[PDB]
């Protein structure tokens, strides 16, 4: 590898070919795994020279080498991405999207994804400079399979970064412009394209119900449910996040997920050996059980209540916390018969066992659930049958103890339970 001193000497020469060789040397230096000297390159003042090389239509190799050098600077810290932006790189890269050389266009796609991926402001600045139209034009072919696989993956990734980040979320008009191309990529037979399109949809559904509706209205929920069943974990993870985001919305949006067949996948998701999949599947279930009684009934009919008992009984603690939420939502919204059924599937003992957790929130959530179940037992006149039952698995003792507990609503709710029913 050249020294930065020698790179500067070549780039400052009055010889395009010497400048090209020094830019290639910079690209290779910036491409090394252990500790590329990005800040030294920036301090040498080389970004403005790279940016001017982007505009050299008559010398496509130096366009490519400087684009690659800038991509690797823009892939670093936010301060390093800012330095690239501050050199004027955004409009220069957008101009290269139309290049007849596919490797240059791809480099510009990559660079704009790094810049937009830095955060909301640079994302929106890339959009204001007009990146979306020429990016989408690169996919305006009748069959995506004629594109080079790596080229297509790069485009999908950059589009997903334009859908990414919040406060603010991407402009509504930009989302509507990008969404039809995302729908297409969601049906493309490449695992990495599918994964990144799912990530893009996961970003677009992470927000208010109006944002969810823009996605749901494009009809993608059945495809997301299909991708929930993929064997590739990199596909299932964002597809599940997208589905979980959608069921934070209205009852009608939640119903489209159920109508699409999503509940049939949850026996596997709720026992998945990847901890994060189990956690997000249980979180998703907790928002479905927060729904209407007929939606709780579909959870019942699909045999998913035993699986909720399972995750409550044994899972990573954060997953068990989501299961507690699922149970409190179920018993808050459910009919008496639905709550009786929950008790018949064995919810009481694992609920009580979690009262030993040193976590105030889950104790509150569980106490709420227990009160909800007693209210159903009152309507049936069977409060004592439930009391004896809490007693027999050791639940009374753990409720007694929380009378002596720091947090106020805990001992409040704990006290009331023992008074009224014990």
């Amino acid at each position: 590898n050249w020294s930065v001193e020698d790179i500067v000497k070549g780039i400052n020469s009055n010889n395009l070919e010497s400048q090209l060789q020094a830019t290639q040397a910079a690209r290779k230096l910036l491409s090394r795994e252990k500790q590329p000297p990005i800040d030294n390159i920036i301090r040498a003042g080389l970004i403005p020279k790279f940016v001017s090389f982007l505009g050299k239509t008559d010398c496509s190799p130096i366009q490519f080498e400087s684009a690659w050098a800038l991509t690797n600077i823009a892939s670093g810290t936010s301060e390093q991405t800012k330095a690239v932006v501050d050199g004027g790189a955004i409009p220069a890269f957008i101009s290269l999207l139309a290049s007849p050389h596919a490797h240059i266009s791809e480099q510009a796609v990559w660079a704009l994804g790094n810049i937009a991926g830095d955060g909301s402001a640079f994302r929106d600045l890339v959009i204001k400079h007009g990146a979306i139209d020429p990016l989408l034009a690169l996919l305006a072919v009748p069959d995506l399979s004629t594109l080079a696989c790596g080229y297509l993956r790069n485009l999908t990734w950059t589009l997903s970064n334009l859908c990414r980040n919040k406060n603010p979320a991407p402009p509504l008009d930009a989302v509507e412009q990008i969404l039809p191309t995302l729908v297409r990529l969601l049906h493309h037979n490449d695992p990495e394209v599918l994964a990144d399109s799912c990530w893009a949809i996961s970003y677009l559904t992470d927000g208010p119900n109006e944002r969810i509706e823009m996605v749901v209205k494009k009809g993608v929920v059945p495809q997301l449910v299909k991708l929930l069943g993929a064997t590739e974990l990199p596909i299932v993870t964002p597809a599940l996040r997208a589905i979980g985001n959608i069921v934070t919305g209205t009852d009608e949006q939640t119903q489209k997920v159920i109508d699409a067949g999503a509940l049939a996948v949850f026996p596997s998701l709720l026992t998945n050996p990847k901890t994060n999949i189990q956690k997000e599947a249980t979180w998703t279930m907790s928002n479905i059980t927060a729904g209407r009684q007929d939606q709780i009934q579909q959870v019942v009919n699909h045999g998913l209540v035993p699986f909720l008992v399972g995750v409550l009984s044994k899972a990573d603690f954060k997953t068990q916390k989501e299961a507690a939420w699922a149970i409190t939502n179920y018993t808050s919204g459910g009919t008496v018969e639905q709550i009786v059924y929950l008790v018949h599937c064995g919810i009481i003992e694992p609920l009580m066992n979690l009262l030993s957790a040193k976590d105030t929130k889950i104790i509150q959530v569980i106490l709420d659930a227990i009160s909800n179940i007693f209210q159903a037992a009152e309507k049936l006149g069977e409060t004592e049958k439930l009391s004896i039952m809490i007693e027999e698995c050791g639940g009374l003792d753990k409720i007694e103890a929380l009378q002596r507990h720091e947090n106020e609503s805990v001992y409040k709710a704990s006290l009331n339970l023992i008074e009224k029913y014990f």
């Binding site: 491409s31 690797n72 991405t81 480099q107 994964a195």
Partner: peptide, 8 residues
């Protein structure tokens, strides 16, 4: 999903 990517 990776937020930024180095081309090696």
């Amino acid at each position: 999903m990776e937020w930024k990517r180095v081309k090696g």
